[PDB]
From a paper:
Gamma delta (γδ) T cells, a unique T cell subgroup, are crucial in various immune responses and immunopathology. The γδ [name] is a heterodimer comprising [name]γ and [name]δ chains, discovered in the mid 1980s9–12. Each [name]γ or [name]δ contains an extracellular domain (ECD) with a Vγ/Cγ or Vδ/Cδ domain, a membrane-proximal connecting peptide (CP), a transmembrane (TM) helix and a short cytoplasmic tail. After antigen engagement, the γδ [name]–[name] complex triggers the phosphorylation of ITAMs within the cytoplasmic tails of [name] subunits, initiating downstream events.
To further confirm the oligomeric state, we introduced the Y106E/R120H (EH) and R120Q mutations in the Vγ5 domain to disrupt the dimer interface. Consistent with our analysis, the FRET signal exhibited a significant reduction in cells expressing these mutant complexes. To examine whether our dimeric Vγ5Vδ1 [name]–[name] structure is a functional state rather than an artificial one, we assessed the function of monomeric EH or R120Q Vγ5Vδ1 TCRs in vivo. We found that EH or R120Q Vγ5Vδ1 [name]+ Jurkat cells did not show any augmentation in CD69 expression after co-culture with APCs. This suggests that the EH or R120Q Vγ5Vδ1 [name] is incapable of initiating T cell activation. To investigate why the monomeric mutant [name] does not initiate T cell activation, we first examined the expression levels of EH or R120Q Vγ5Vδ1 [name] and [name] subunits on the plasma membrane. Both EH and R120Q Vγ5Vδ1 [name]+ Jurkat cells exhibited sufficient surface expression. Using a ligand tetramer-binding assay, we found that WT Vγ5Vδ1 [name]+ Jurkat cells displayed strong staining with CD1d–α-GalCer tetramers, whereas EH or R120Q Vγ5Vδ1 [name]+ Jurkat cells showed no detectable staining. Compared with the WT complex, which possesses two binding sites for the CD1d–α-GalCer tetramer, the EH or R120Q [name]–[name] complex has only one binding site. The distinction between bivalent and monovalent binding provides a plausible explanation for the lack of surface staining of the monomeric [name] mutants. Thus, we demonstrate that dimeric WT Vγ5Vδ1 [name], but not monomeric EH or R120Q mutant, is required for T cell activation.
Residue numbers in the entry:
A (entry chain e): 33 to 66, 75 to 101, 109 to 153
B (entry chain n): 252 to 288
C (entry chain g): 26 to 47, 54 to 65, 71 to 140
D (entry chain m): 256 to 289
E (entry chain d): 22 to 126
F (entry chain a), H (entry chain b): 27 to 54
G (entry chain f): 33 to 49, 58 to 65, 74 to 154
Write the structure that this text describes.
């Protein structure tokens, strides 16, 4: 019932199985042992969608992972607000600096 | 989506030109201001 | 087959093009070393490529990529705006310098 | 696709800088008269 | 047990031969037909945990497939050259404005 | 995306203009 | 030896070296010239060959590959013209501003 | 259509701001 976590940052992609947080877990892709594994998670790079984008299962020595992602290097997402507040905070800080300089210089 | 990017890259050159053209007026003002004061 | 062993990789929806054959040379010079990656199509790749195997020096083939993301518009609906904005800004700056010189 | 977004963000940044530069030049020119 | 994921030109769907329960994530739109759900538009970043049982010949075995889409159409690709170039000139412009305002007083 | 770039700067600029006019009309 | 020279003007693509594409003997196919209009990306791309008579076309020196899209009256520049436009605009603005400044000092 | 109207609004409102700043400066 505990959902999988995944953070696709740049080209390296992280996949973790938090079902067994007190041990180390192996990894397969279409029942084939698999670029490398980690202590608990998957550190994978040079991602592609045509290959290496299928069903993943973690197993120690019925919760299955299937994902697809168009990995884009040094490249993330931002909605309207995440860029709408940047101009607001810039205006706020420049106004604060202006007011401080004006008031301090009598 | 091609037309929007086309117009956007049209406007970018406009604004770079306007900034680089206002820089010269800033430079001409600052010389006179320094000479006066 | 047919002494044209170089075959560019197609059917790619990503911003990355691939070239392969069944070391490497750029314009006949030693730049490549070893499916050798070529680069992204956004940067408008060019050059001359070479692959060879058991048979002797194979026969080249070039790739032209035109993908610009830099082309601008040039019809009357845009040149009018450019001229208007440039002339208005020039007039404003002229008025400003005129007055300025009035004080001095 | 994923490149037009920077083209749209950079033009907004340049608009911001244009406003800032015009404010600078207006303030300096106004001060010169005093 | 695998949960097949079909994909048409512009549709993403979930199929089983039994009832499938949406517990966490995004369900998309409500559909009354059994053993089938419609996720919706391909460009929506659909995410969720979907719980689908087995068929009549595979009774009493549960399968849970985590389906995650990251096909972003509102994402921005950044290069260090442009953002640094604009941030440095913004900083120098702001410093200058402050200087001017000060001089004014 | 275009409506965002339309509204974001023009709101602040518009407000500026209004607050400037109001002052000018009040002084007059 | 020399790669074929192509310089698209507007929607017109011009290329020269016979001329075939996937050996299938609008599209302007001339005996010593090759030009092509409405260069759509989906339907007009692939491989091109310059081969002479008396030979099966798979002995040409080297191939071609085009994936160009073209709009109506759109022209692109490397960094040669942008510098030219910037410098000519700076010269014009400086000359006009200096002239109107000298006219001001009366 | 939206980007062109957007830039037109930017320009017109900017000119209005400049002229109103001048008028406010003179009256004060
Ligand atoms: C971006 C800039 C260059 C646009 C032009 C603005 C500058 C150069 C001009 C435009 C209007 C001008 C102002 C118009 C009227 C007055 C009132 C007068 O009693 C003192 C000078 C003063 C205050 C002028 C100073 C210079 C001024 C502010």
């Amino acid at each position: 019932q505990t959902p999988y976590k995944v953070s696709i940052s740049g080209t390296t992609v992280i996949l973790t199985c938090p079902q067994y947080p007190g041990s180390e877990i192996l990894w397969q892709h279409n029942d084939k042992n698999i670029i490398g594994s980690d202590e608990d998670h998957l550190s994978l790079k040079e991602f592609s969608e045509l290959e290496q984008s299928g069903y993943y299962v973690c197993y120690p020595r019925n919760f299955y992972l299937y994902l697809r992602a168009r990995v884009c290097e040094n490249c993330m997402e931002m909605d309207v607000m995440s860029v709408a507040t940047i101009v607001i905070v810039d205006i706020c800080i420049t106004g604060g600096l202006l007011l401080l300089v004006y008031y301090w210089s009598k | 989506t091609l037309l929007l990017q086309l117009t956007n890259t049209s406007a970018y050159y406009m604004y770079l030109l306007l900034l680089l053209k206002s820089v010269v007026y800033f430079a001409i003002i600052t010389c006179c201001l320094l000479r006066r004061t | 087959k047919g002494n044209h062993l170089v075959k560019v990789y197609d059917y790619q929806e990503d911003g990355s093009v691939l070239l392969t054959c069944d070391t490497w040379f750029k314009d006949g010079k030693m730049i490549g070393f070893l499916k050798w990656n070529l680069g992204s199509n956004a940067k408008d790749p060019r050059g001359m490529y070479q692959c060879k195997g058991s048979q002797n020096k194979s026969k080249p083939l070039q790739v032209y990529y035109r993908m610009c993301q830099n082309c601008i518009e040039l019809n009357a609906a845009t040149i009018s705006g450019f001229l208007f904005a440039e002339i208005v800004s020039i007039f404003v700056l002229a008025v400003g310098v005129y007055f300025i010189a009035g004080q001095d | 696709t994923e490149k037009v977004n920077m083209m749209s963000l950079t033009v907004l940044g340049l608009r911001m800088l244009f406003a800032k530069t015009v404010a600078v030049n207006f303030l300096l020119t106004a001060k010169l008269f005093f | 047990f695998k949960i097949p994921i079909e994909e048409l030109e512009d549709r993403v769907f979930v199929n089983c031969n039994t009832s499938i329960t949406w517990v966490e994530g995004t369900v998309g739109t409500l559909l009354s037909d059994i053993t089938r759900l419609d996720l919706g538009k391909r460009i929506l970043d659909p995410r969720g945990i979907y719980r689908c049982n087995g068929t009549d010949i595979y009774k009493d075995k549960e399968s849970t497939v985590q389906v995650h889409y990251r096909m972003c159409q509102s994402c921005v690709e950044l290069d260090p050259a442009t953002v640094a170039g604009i941030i440095v000139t913004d900083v120098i412009a702001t410093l200058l404005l402050a200087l001017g305002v000060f001089c004014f007083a | 995306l275009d409506p965002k770039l339309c509204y974001l700067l023009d709101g602040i600029l518009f407000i500026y203009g209004v607050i400037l006019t109001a002052l000018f009309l009040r002084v007059k």
